[PDB]
Amino acid sequence: IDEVPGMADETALLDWLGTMREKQPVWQDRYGVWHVFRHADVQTVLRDTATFSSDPTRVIEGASPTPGMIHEIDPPEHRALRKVVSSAFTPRTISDLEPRIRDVTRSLLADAGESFDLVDVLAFPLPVTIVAELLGLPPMDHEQFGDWSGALVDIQMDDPTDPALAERIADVLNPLTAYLKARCAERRADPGDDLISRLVLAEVDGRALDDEEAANFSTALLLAGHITTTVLLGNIVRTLDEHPAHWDAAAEDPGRIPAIVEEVLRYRPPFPQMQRTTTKATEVAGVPIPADVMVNTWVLSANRDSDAHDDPDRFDPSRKSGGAAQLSFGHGVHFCLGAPLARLENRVALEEIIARFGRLTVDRDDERLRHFEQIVLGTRHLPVLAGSSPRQSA
Ligand code: HEM
Numbered sequence: 579i580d581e582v583p584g585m586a587d588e589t590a591l592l593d594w595l596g597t598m599r600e601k602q603p604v605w606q607d608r609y610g611v612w613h614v615f616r617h618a619d620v621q622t623v624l625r626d627t628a629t630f631s632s633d634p635t636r637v638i639e640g641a642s643p644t645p646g647m648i649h650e651i652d653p654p655e656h657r658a659l660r661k662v663v664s665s666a667f668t669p670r671t672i673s674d675l676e677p678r679i680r681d682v683t684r685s686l687l688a689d690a691g692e693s694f695d696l697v698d699v700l701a702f703p704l705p706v707t708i709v710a711e712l713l714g715l716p717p718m719d720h721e722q723f724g725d726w727s728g729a730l731v732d733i734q735m736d737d738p739t740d741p742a743l744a745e746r747i748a749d750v751l752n753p754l755t756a757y758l759k760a761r762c763a764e765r766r767a768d769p770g771d772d773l774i775s776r777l778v779l780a781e782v783d784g785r786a787l788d789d790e791e792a793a794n795f796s797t798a799l800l801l802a803g804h805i806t807t808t809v810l811l812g813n814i815v816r817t818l819d820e821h822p823a824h825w826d827a828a829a830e831d832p833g834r835i836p837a838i839v840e841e842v843l844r845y846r847p848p849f850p851q852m853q854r855t856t857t858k859a860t861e862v863a864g865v866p867i868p869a870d871v872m873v874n875t876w877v878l879s880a881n882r883d884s885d886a887h888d889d890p891d892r893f894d895p896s897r898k899s900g901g902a903a904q905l906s907f908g909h910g911v912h913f914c915l916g917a918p919l920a921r922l923e924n925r926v927a928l929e930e931i932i933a934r935f936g937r938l939t940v941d942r943d944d945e946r947l948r949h950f951e952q953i954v955l956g957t958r959h960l961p962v963l964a965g966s967s968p969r970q971s972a
């Protein structure tokens with residue numbers, strides 16, 4: 579009746595979510611937030627944007643959406659802005675990144691010894707380097723860019739109800755946003771082919787982005803790639819380490835890797851929950867929910883729901899997977915804009931791990947392994963051990 583268990587103890591959280599799907603699939607917590615646990619009900623909510631709005635500022639007095647952020651806005655404005663941003667951040671822009679992601683990955687892994695932190699070595703520097711280059715930032719600016727991004731990632735280790743959270747976020751986000759806004763002005767003066775240049779030049783149905791909107795979107799790209807590569811890649815290695823036969827399977831046929839990625843997403847989604855606000859009195863699975871309250875859709879619970887997935891707690895890459903049905907990227911019109919980049923970056927990273935090492939295991943003699951306590955499902959670091967590498971003279 580009391581409290582939502584924390585992210586850190588994954589077993590207890592998963593156990594609790596099980597009991598809820600079973601006994602209270604639509605639950606109202608002590609703060610008046612409504613949780614939704616079943617795959618079918620989560621889908622219902624995510625599809626009905628008219629009832630379940632993505633704007634959480636509407637019920638907070640003088641707060642308004644962040645300009646250039648598509649995840650806080652509803653149709654029809656949502657469609658119009660995602661059109662503008664996509665015309666810049668295009669499918670071909672992402673896919674063209676493969677050789678460089680591979681190059682950076684291969685270089686970063688070649689200097690890692692045999693015992694190292696997978697996050698410090700790879701999962702943290704790779705996405706920052708890639709986004710920075712995508713954005714067109716001078717190499718000399720990259721370190722500070724990653725410093726700002728890292729500081730924001732570190733904050734997510736902290737309690738979200740800590741009343742200083744908002745202020746701490748502001749002290750890093752402000753200079754980061756200032757920086758990007760100044761780069762947008764620069765590309766406006768002299769546009770090239772980098773993403774910031776495409777952002778300031780983009781226009782769809784007469785809608786163009788100002789430097790504020792362009793910089794905010796660029797900020798979301800940085801933080802999205804950084805946090806998610808850190809979390810998903812760690813989850814990939816942790817999960818494979820629990821089912822180590824797949825390492826050999828993927829070594830013999832690297833074409834098996836995209837399915838592994840999808841199954842790790844299902845099994846250990848970087849974001850276990852998403853939020854909506856009701857716009858009117860409504861119902862989920864016969865349970866009445868009043869107007870103007872927050873609803874939490876538990877992607878984690880839905881992904882483990884036996885009505886949606888056979889033997890839902892079995893790690894099994896052989897499942898049908900892929901595409902728009904990957905609930906870990908959400909569902910419907912807000913389906914992750916970065917899904918192609920996520921899928922690409924983590925596939926290349928896993929290809930390269932296997933290429934050099936054959937496998938990694940989570941280091942047992944090291945608990946630098948601190949789980950994110952809220953928002954994210956995974957760890958800030960992942961101490962690993964390579965049993966084999968090209969460095970062995972045997
Ligand atoms: C494994 C990696 C990732 C996961 C698990 C993930 C997850 C998600 C989820 C669940 C949503 C939907 C939020 C909602 O419905 O309210 C979303 C939206 C979004 N994601 Fe990702 N994401 C990942 C990687 C990325 C990357 C690399 C980018 C870089 C652009 C990105 C950018 C975005 C953007 C801009 C939105 C808002 C889309 C919209 O509102 O139309 N994500 N993401």
Ligand SMILES: Clc1ccccc1C(c1ccccc1)(c1ccccc1)n1ccnc1
Pocket residue numbers: 730731733734747751797798799801802953
């Ligand atoms: Cl964490 C989060 C969740 C949902 C929306 C925005 C953010 C965000 C943030 C803050 C700290 C660490 C990582 C991300 C954020 C998301 C994307 C880009 C920048 C910041 N944020 C919190 C307050 N304003 C913006």
Ligand SMILES: Clc1ccccc1C(c1ccccc1)(c1ccccc1)n1ccnc1
Pocket residue numbers: 647649798801802803805806849851852853914916953
């Ligand atoms: Cl970029 C970010 C940082 C920290 C937490 C969440 C996100 C973000 C998101 C927003 C709502 C629900 C789940 C995740 C996000 C926040 C603000 C703007 C864009 C994306 N995200 C990271 C990757 N894809 C989406």
